[PDB]
Amino acid sequence: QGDIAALLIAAGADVNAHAKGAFFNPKYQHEGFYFGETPLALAACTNQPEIVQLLMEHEQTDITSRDSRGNNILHALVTVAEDFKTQNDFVKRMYDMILLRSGNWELETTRNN
Amino acid sequence: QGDIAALLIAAGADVNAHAKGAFFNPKYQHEGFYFGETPLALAACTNQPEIVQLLMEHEQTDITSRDSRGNNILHALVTVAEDFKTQNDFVKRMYDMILLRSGNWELETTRNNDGLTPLQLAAKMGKAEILKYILSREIKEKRLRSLSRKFTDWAYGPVSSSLYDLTNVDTTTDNSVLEITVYNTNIDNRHEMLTLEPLHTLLHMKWKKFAKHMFFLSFCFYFFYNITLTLVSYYRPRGWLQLLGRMFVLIWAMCISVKEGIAIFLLRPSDLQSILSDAWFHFVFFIQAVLVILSVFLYLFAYKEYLACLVLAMALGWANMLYYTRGFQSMGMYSVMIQKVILHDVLKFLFVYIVFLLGFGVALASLIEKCPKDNKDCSSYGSFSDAVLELFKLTIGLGDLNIQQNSKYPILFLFLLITYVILTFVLLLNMLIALMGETVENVSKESERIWRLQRARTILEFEKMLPEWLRSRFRMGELCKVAEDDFRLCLRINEVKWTEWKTHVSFLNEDPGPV
Amino acid sequence: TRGFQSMGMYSVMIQKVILHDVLKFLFVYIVFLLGFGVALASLIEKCPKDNKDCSSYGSFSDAVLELFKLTIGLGDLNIQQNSKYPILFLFLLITYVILTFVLLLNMLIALMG
Ligand code: NA
Numbered sequence: 001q002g003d004i005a006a007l008l009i010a011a012g013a014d015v016n017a018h019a020k021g022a023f024f025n026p027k028y029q030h031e032g033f034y035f036g037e038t039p040l041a042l043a044a045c046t047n048q049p050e051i052v053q054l055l056m057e058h059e060q061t062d063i064t065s066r067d068s069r070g071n072n073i074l075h076a077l078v079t080v081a082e083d084f085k086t087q088n089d090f091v092k093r094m095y096d097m098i099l100l101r102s103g104n105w106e107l108e109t110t111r112n113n
Numbered sequence: 114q115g116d117i118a119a120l121l122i123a124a125g126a127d128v129n130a131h132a133k134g135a136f137f138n139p140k141y142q143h144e145g146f147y148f149g150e151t152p153l154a155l156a157a158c159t160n161q162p163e164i165v166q167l168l169m170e171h172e173q174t175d176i177t178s179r180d181s182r183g184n185n186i187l188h189a190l191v192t193v194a195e196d197f198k199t200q201n202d203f204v205k206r207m208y209d210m211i212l213l214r215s216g217n218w219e220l221e222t223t224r225n226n227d228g229l230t231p232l233q234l235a236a237k238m239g240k241a242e243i244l245k246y247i248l249s250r251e252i253k254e255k256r257l258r259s260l261s262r263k264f265t266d267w268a269y270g271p272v273s274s275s276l277y278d279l280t281n282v283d284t285t286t287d288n289s290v291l292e293i294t295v296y297n298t299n300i301d302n303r304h305e306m307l308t309l310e311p312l313h314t315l316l317h318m319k320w321k322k323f324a325k326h327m328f329f330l331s332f333c334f335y336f337f338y339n340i341t342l343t344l345v346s347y348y349r350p351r352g353w354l355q356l357l358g359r360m361f362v363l364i365w366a367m368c369i370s371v372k373e374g375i376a377i378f379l380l381r382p383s384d385l386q387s388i389l390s391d392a393w394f395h396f397v398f399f400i401q402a403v404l405v406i407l408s409v410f411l412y413l414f415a416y417k418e419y420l421a422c423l424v425l426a427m428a429l430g431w432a433n434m435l436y437y438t439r440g441f442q443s444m445g446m447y448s449v450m451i452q453k454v455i456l457h458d459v460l461k462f463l464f465v466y467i468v469f470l471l472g473f474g475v476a477l478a479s480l481i482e483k484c485p486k487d488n489k490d491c492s493s494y495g496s497f498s499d500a501v502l503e504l505f506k507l508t509i510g511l512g513d514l515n516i517q518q519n520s521k522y523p524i525l526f527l528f529l530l531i532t533y534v535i536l537t538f539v540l541l542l543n544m545l546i547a548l549m550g551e552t553v554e555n556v557s558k559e560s561e562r563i564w565r566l567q568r569a570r571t572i573l574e575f576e577k578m579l580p581e582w583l584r585s586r587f588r589m590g591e592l593c594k595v596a597e598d599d600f601r602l603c604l605r606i607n608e609v610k611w612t613e614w615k616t617h618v619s620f621l622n623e624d625p626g627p628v
Numbered sequence: 629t630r631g632f633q634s635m636g637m638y639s640v641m642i643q644k645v646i647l648h649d650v651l652k653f654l655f656v657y658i659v660f661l662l663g664f665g666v667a668l669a670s671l672i673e674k675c676p677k678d679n680k681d682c683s684s685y686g687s688f689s690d691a692v693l694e695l696f697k698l699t700i701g702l703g704d705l706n707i708q709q710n711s712k713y714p715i716l717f718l719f720l721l722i723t724y725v726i727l728t729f730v731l732l733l734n735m736l737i738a739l740m741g
Pocket of ligand 1: 701
């Protein structure tokens with residue numbers, strides 16, 4: 001819901017909330033879905049470029065935010081990324097879009113736990 | 114003629130007429146066309162959705178009408194339905210349209226004169242396309258959702274879990290889709306029908322619960338059965354502590370004989386292919402078991418032929434070990450490869466080889482002079498039996514080739530020997546390897562499904578051996594699929610698909626986390 | 629053999645052939661080899677006091693050795709053994725040849741292809 005999410009951010013929604021729940025960090029690949037536990041990464045991993053652009057343009061968004069695993073936005077895309085037969089190369093395009101928006105090597109050189 | 118039929122209905126045409134003629138109910142598929150003998154089914158089976166919609170909207174139309182066979186509209190579509198290469202999936206679309214219009218489970222649960230539901234009829238007639246749709250059926254539109262067989266309880270992004278209805282697809286009922294699709298003998302697409310989402314997972318879930326342990330337990334009992342049988346036969350006289358092992362073989366042979374005696378009886382094998390594709394191991398196990406019983410019967414009498422039957426039990430008993438190769442994908446696919454190789458190539462090769470073996474055997478032995486009074490072993494091709502034995506050893510590369518036989522035409526005798534080598538060693542033996550490679554390529558792309566089909570037969574047999582109790586290894590319990598007191602036994606399957614990216618508004622539980 | 633493309637690709641071909649086909653072939657062959665070894669040695673009468681080498685299938689070890697040589701085409705096939713059922717003894721020998729020489733040995737070449 002891009003239109004609904006757009007007005008929530010203007011209303012004062014926390015764009016840096018971390019979903020540290022058990023479902024968002026599953027031990028396996030069947031009882032949960034890991035995406036980075038952040039709204040910026042959730043839109044990135046769900047093939048929602050419009051929300052990603054809106055979130056990145058926001059001044060309060062922390063692009064270099066680290067989750068419980070220590071993963072940044074780029075790390076979450078790598079884990080989420082799959083083969084071309086499964087994913088329509090949207091992660092690769094999303095990886096380029098987010099990296100260019102930051103325009104720095106800090107995000108690329110970040111190390112997780 | 115949709116326009117012509119439209120005014121006929123308004124004029125007072127009977128929309129429930131039954132065409133009970135011989136042509137509309139043919140005995141075969143060439144002298145008639147069966148469609149349900151009703152105008153509602155005729156338009157459905159002839160790909161005429163406009164007439165079907167007009168007929169269904171009519172107040173006098175009886176959707177749940179039954180023909181002489183007891184078939185309803187849904188049954189007629191199942192019989193009419195064919196493969197995708199023949200029919201443009203119009204039956205599947207027509208099946209959905211008619212079922213949604215009725216909006217009730219009465220039509221789906223109706224049984225014909227054979228006591229088969231439309232869901233069961235698809236498995237009985239091997240309609241994989243119809244069975245796939247019904248087993249995995251989701252109705253997105255509201256106001257009618259209990260008719261679905263597939264439900265997604267929760268979904269979060271690409272990860273979602275699906276629940277497949279198992280009220281009529283399980284071993285709990287007397288006759289179900291799973292039982293039919295495995296024990297069917299009138300269809301040749303069972304391995305394709307077992308690849309469906311609910312059927313494939315249901316077999317896998319029960320395989321790892323009880324079937325895996327019972328299969329290993331059966332192997333251990335049979336392995337010890339042959340080990341003990343081999344030792345007593347090999348170490349036979351030519352005591353008081355090892356007597357328990359000897360009684361085990363006799364008792365276990367009776368158990369196999371009784372179990373295989375009824376298993377073949379209830380299977381009702383009619384076609385030759387069914388023997389080699391569904392009951393080959395039901396006979397050789399029975400034959401091996403009765404040979405031990407026969408040997409014991411002859412042992413207590415004065416007949417010395419008990420040893421001959423005892424040896425046959427040993428050779429056949431160890432040969433029966435290849436049945437237990439299933440359960441393992443690598444060994445199971447290897448075993449099903451042997452069956453195709455034997456029937457397609459080995460049996461065909463042996464028939465021609467014997468003709469050449471026996472054909473040259475009489476010829477070579479014909480031009481053999483009688484041995485002199487001094488040397489009585491002048492020629493190794495003395496008789497027909499000797500000639501075949503020498504040629505048989507020649508084919509397998511054993512012994513020495515002595516062409517200095519007592520033949521009155523040594524050049525002619527050698528000419529036939531070289532011809533036999535070219536026909537057998539060069540032509541028949543070498544071509545068999547090439548021919549099997551063609552069959553290996555054709556089977557390797559489908560041998561995996563065949564092994565699962567053979568393995569699935571074992572799962573059902575083991576489950577039937579279970580008593581009335583101990584049946585606590587079923588699937589997930591009752592789930593509130595619909596708030597109107599609709600609880601169904603469902604199987605949970607989780608799938609991930611980064612393709613459509615839809616909005617989940619047709620779920621059962623808001624919370625995605627399992628609980 | 630690695631370092632050379634021709635020899636290196638040949639070596640990795642051996643590993644797949646051994647695991648996928650050779651090991652699978654040997655397991656079935658041993659069952660037939662040992663299964664017929666006990667059977668053939670079972671119907672062998674004791675040698676007379678005059679000739680102590682009446683039959684080459686004297687024991688289980690001898691029976692397997694003769695069948696092993698039969699599979700590889702070594703020695704001579706002497707069916708005039710001291711068997712109380714020569715027809716049955718020859719029946720198992722021919723069955724072993726069909727199962728091994730005709731079926732198992734030939735199918736291995738096709739499967740590896
Ligand atoms: Na040789």
